[PDB]
Symmetry: C3
Subunit: 351 residues, 3 copies
């Protein structure tokens, strides 16, 4: 059918109560041999109501954390202290594997939506979270040690340790909270494409130290209803495209082991499509839309356009060769390619 | 029967007409578990008659392109222009994934033979080519986009787009013809040169294009009757491609206490043998011969000789220890090892 | 049941005679899908009696070589000459793939015990040895070439080649020595121990501090504990540690997460026994006797050890009162108090109360 399309319903709920939820996308390679280059990566969605705290835990994986909606306070605990960060909409930050952290939605009215990208290394494709808190879904990891180990460790009788640290709590890992390097914004630089129809912002590993270690680019797409992101392809980056707001009509063109395949889907909020490198892709805004792209294998990526005035590789083929490439003449090919005056994003209204 | 040997007949014909052919070697790991270290690599052979053009296309893979015979004009298309390169025999150049390119045989009389080495990353072991031109085998990938997407993109009626770009013009991708440049395998002094043979070798340490791929390229020329004496590579696995003449290869592997096996084959034009790192190998020229070696995992490769005067590791074992290593005496081992006065290449005539 | 535990009996004997032995641990991923991150690595143990020589051979793999007991002379053969190294107890060195070498136990009285860590690249998970010497288990690899190839190569009649290089002389690849006189090794204990109190010491060499370890992305540590001492619950952020019991008996408790579900892996380790400690998994270790252990940490770059008990480097103590109160069933005050009870750091008295 479409091995590149992941609907909101292909997410497993890890935890949910009335205060928020943690969801985990199935392995990219669960249902297809075609995405073995994504086997090390998992996607998570965290959603929390006003005045909520995700209790402290470390992941066995590196995390890229992105605020899709609202605002957050992120605390990273280290062996000798802690670092406290305010995250606004569009703010991203890397959490190093094995750093205990907790996440607060400090807003009194607006929900918090966070996209988490996991880069796994201990057990490729597997993400584990170690929660200090004992809850219905799992006891504290501390509880797995023997009585003698715990008593000697904390120099305290087991009874005190058990009542003070271990006993299974009444809420889960998201609770209501009293008072009832650095983050970087996806839009911290000038957009790389910008006209009356759309904008794309892009942060690359070349320009960002946190993204450099992961070999990842992040982009942020805004388009007006009826705008069309024209046919183009990425030379190196495979892009995990996340629908944030609005509805996107995607056409993806692939070669499969033999056959030429069209992949066409309308994506609503939460929906994900993978755009493999070299595969031509185009995207029409059915409503005003915001989308986030995560590009893996990002180093030295180059975007090649197949329509419009600027960065159109077809326009760069000389008349002599275009004449032999296409049924038209060099003159007819050149003329047709000049008809589109816009670049990158155009009017997608039919005629 | 020799999992390292790939005869010309283990190539699939991807495309062939009266103007030329493109052939693709089976996956190194198709028929053996012994070459998992080569799973990311594929070999292609392109042959074209005089005054031919391979039509513009991009690959999803990095390409090392090497002219085995003749001359080529190579055009690399970028979003803002194009680079044109003359390739002579022995000239190699890396084509970055997603770079549209076309290949002309400008010669009036001599064929063009090209060796293409594919380094895959999107789908390991799979190489895809995206041809702009519609042909009998497959329509243009542009044709896979919807009518509304194409009309909006090119700001032109579908009729004109279809007649100018999309209709099947050529029957095949080979037709009649009306930053950082190629390097020749012999642009440096050969590393071994005597009356019997020469080896030229370009390493990733000395070539910016090879550095990113961790690959070395070597070029072997021997006179009929010359013998390339037993040696092994510490790190590089060498894909050895017979170009001209007939090569008698002896490869020694430790493959089921382990069973010790000789893999002996005579290689003729197109035939490939893989020489795993650490495996002793020798080659006798049955006729005058030329061969090309592609060495992967090339960084810090060191070639250890088991015979001859220079770079002979056995000669470096002191008498006391060689006396315990070999049935001879230290003196008898030292004396025997001094009998061969030549280095690297010797007279291979039967006693 | 415990997929992280490798008893001395999960080693295959590659070679053994009266002079010593070479043993090879089963693939980390032979019996479990949980150790895919260790697929490229193998562990070997070489043991030799006094006055012994392991005959010249190259490996298809990179080798990290560590003297667990006694002393060695290591000779590396290069195309143009040779390098000779003295290795004492706690000395390690990397041997480059394809470098022929020989190993001597020069001591007259003490055995030589060496831990070999193989980093495979030719055939991931496979380590091969190429011996120049013909023995019962295998003829010389030189013998596998045709007569004509050998005669032309050595410019000698096959009879002299065969008598001088090829004939099976030695019974095995470990032989007695008549006379032992006829970037350099580094010691695990060359720096201050990073943890040291009255109960235990840990020494650690990291890729950040050692060029040989940097190219392999490996850290080595060396653990010494007194009977009754306890290495308190902690975890490694990035390094998966292959823990090798050298002397005495260790009681290990390892806590894993494969809903996913919570698992205790408890084992007592005797000499030779190995346990794998995956990164992020809390671990603790009690010395049943005086104990020495060696850790090989892979994926070592930027590893940080987080302690869950004791005063120093205790991540739990760095959670503010307000949040501790919400994290634990106790109150911020009761949590803070309890975490301050243990006055020691890293290693404590493990005696039951
Ligand atoms: Ca040849
Ligand atoms: Ca002898
Ligand atoms: Ca000794």
């Amino acid at each position: 059918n479409n091995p590149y399309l992941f609907r909101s319903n292909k997410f497993l709920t890890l935890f949910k109560n009335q205060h928020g939820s943690l969801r985990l996308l199935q392995r990219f390679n669960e249902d297809t041999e075609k995405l073995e280059n994504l086997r090390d990566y998992r996607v998570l969605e965290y959603c929390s109501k006003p005045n909520t705290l995700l209790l402290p835990h470390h992941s066995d994986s590196d995390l890229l954390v992105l605020v899709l909606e609202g605002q957050a306070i992120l605390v990273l605990v280290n062996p000798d202290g802690r670092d406290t960060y305010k995250l606004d909409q569009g703010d991203a930050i890397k959490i190093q594997a094995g750093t205990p952290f907790y996440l607060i939605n400090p807003d009194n009215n607006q929900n918090l939506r966070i996209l988490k990208f996991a880069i796994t290394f201990r057990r490729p494709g597997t993400v584990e979270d170690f929660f200090l808190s004992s809850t219905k879904r799992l006891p504290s990891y501390l509880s797995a040690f023997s009585k003698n180990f715990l008593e000697a460790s904390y120099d305290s009788p087991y009874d005190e340790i058990e009542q003070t640290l271990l006993q299974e709590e009444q809420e889960g890992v998201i609770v209501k909270m009293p008072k009832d390097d650095k983050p970087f914004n996806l839009r911290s630089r000038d957009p790389i494409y910008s006209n009356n129809y759309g904008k794309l912002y892009e942060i690359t590993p070349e320009k960002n130290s946190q993204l450099r270690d992961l070999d990842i680019l992040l982009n942020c797409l805004q388009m007006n209803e009826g705008a069309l992101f024209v046919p183009h392809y990425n030379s190196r980056a495979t892009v995990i495209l996340v629908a944030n707001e609005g509805r996107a009509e995607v056409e993806l063109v692939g070669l499969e082991q033999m056959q030429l395949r069209r992949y066409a889907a309308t994506l609503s909020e939460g929906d994900i499509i993978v755009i493999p490198s070299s595969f031509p892709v185009a995207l029409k805004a059915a409503s005003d839309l915001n989308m986030v792209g995560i590009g893996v294998n990002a180093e030295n990526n180059e975007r090649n356009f197949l329509a419009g005035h600027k960065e159109n590789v077809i326009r760069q083929i000389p008349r002599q060769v275009s004449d032999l490439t296409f049924p038209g003449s060099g003159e007819e090919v050149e003329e047709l390619l000049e008809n589109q005056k816009e670049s990158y994003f155009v009017d997608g209204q039919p005629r």
